[PDB]
């Protein structure tokens, strides 16, 4: 539940770039997150949690652009 | 539950860049986070949590841009 | 639950850069965080937590930009 | 956005009564309430607010029952 | 945004009564309340707020019951 | 945003009563309350606030019960 607002992003002879909560080359395994969570008289059971992640880029001469400007 | 607001991002003969809570080349394993969490008369059980992560970039001549401007 | 506000980010013949709580080349394993967490008459049990993380960049001639400007 | 849950309300030779957030003989005028309200880059204007309320019961021998049991 | 939970309200040869956040004979005028309210880059204007309330019960021999048991 | 939890309210040859944040015979005028309120880069203007409240019960032989048991 994220809110993103941008009023009047004006650019003239320039660059108005903006990159929010971006993931790039990220490996996550068996993680638990909780935001704005309410438990009232509740029960929760959970067994073994097994997770494995991997991010392997073998790269050369890459131009990656998640938002913004790249002039090469 | 994050809120991102930007009013009048104006640029002229320049650069207005902005990068928020970005992850890049990040490895997370078996982590637990809690933000704004309320437990009321609740029970929670959890078994073994096994996690493994890996981020390996073998790279040369990379131009990565998550927001902003890159002029090369 | 983070709040990001920026009013009138104006740039002229210059650079207005901003990078918030960014992670880059970060390895986390079996960590527990708690922000604004309330326990009321609650029980919580947890088993063995096993985690392993790794971030290995073997790199040369990289131009990484998470927000801001990079002119090379 | 209220939640009301009742599990196994059992009664035997007795009374299981329950009255939640009830109003009775209540007068409200020109009040403003806000619960879980989020304003993001918003404008709000409001003129004169004129309100008048009145609750007048001229009564005798009344048996009022909002939930529960009344044995007279 | 209130939560009401009741597990196993059992009664035998007795009374299990419960009255939550009840108003009775209450007069409110020109009051402002705020619970869990977030303002982000917002403007709010408000004019004169005029309010008047009144609760007048001229009563005799009344049996009022908002939840619970009344045996008379 | 109030939370009300009750587990196993059992009664036998007795009384299990419970009254939470109840108002009765309460007069409020031009009051301002704030709970868990966050202002970020926000403006708020407010004019004259005029309020008047009144609670007048002229009563005899009243049996009022907001939760609990009344045996008369």
Numbering used by the authors:
A (entry chain C), B (entry chain A), C (entry chain B), D (entry chain F), E (entry chain D), F (entry chain E): 1 to 72
Extract from the study:
α-Synuclein forms amyloid fibrils that are critical in the progression of Parkinson’s disease and serves as the pathological hallmark of this condition. Different posttranslational modifications have been identified at multiple sites of α-synuclein, influencing its conformation, aggregation and function. In this study, we focus on α-syn S87, which can be modified by both phosphorylation and O-GlcNAcylation. Remarkably, we revealed by using cryo-EM that pS87 α-syn and gS87 α-syn form amyloid fibrils with distinct structures.
For pS87 sample, 2D classification identified two different fibril morphologies, including the straight filament polymorph (~74%) and the twisted filament polymorph (~26%). Besides, we managed to obtain the high-quality density map of the twisted filament with an overall resolution of 2.6 Å. The pS87 twisted filament features a half pitch of ~154 nm, a helical rise of 2.41 Å, and a helical twist of −179.72°. In the pS87 α-syn fibril, α-syn adopts an arch-like fold in the fibril core, composed of residues M1 to T72 folding into 7 β-strands (β1-β7). Unlike the gS87 and unmodified WT α-syn fibrils formed under identical condition, the entire N-terminal region participates in fibril core formation in the pS87 fibril. While, the phosphorylated S87 is excluded from the fibril core, and remains flexible and invisible from cryo-EM. Starting from residue 73, the extended C-terminal region (residues 73-140) remains highly flexible in the fibril structure, without electron density. In the pS87 fibril structure, residues 1-29 from the N-terminal form a U-shaped structure stabilized by two pairs of salt bridges, including K6 & E20 and K21 & D2. Meanwhile, V3 and M5 on β1 establish hydrophobic interactions with residues L38’ and V40’ from the neighboring chain, forming intermolecular interactions that bring the two protofilaments together. The second U-shaped structure is formed by residues 30-49, stabilized by a salt bridge between K32 and E46 and a hydrogen bond between K34 and Y39. β2 (residues 26-29) forms a steric zipper-like hydrophobic interaction with residues 52-55, connecting the two U-shaped structures.
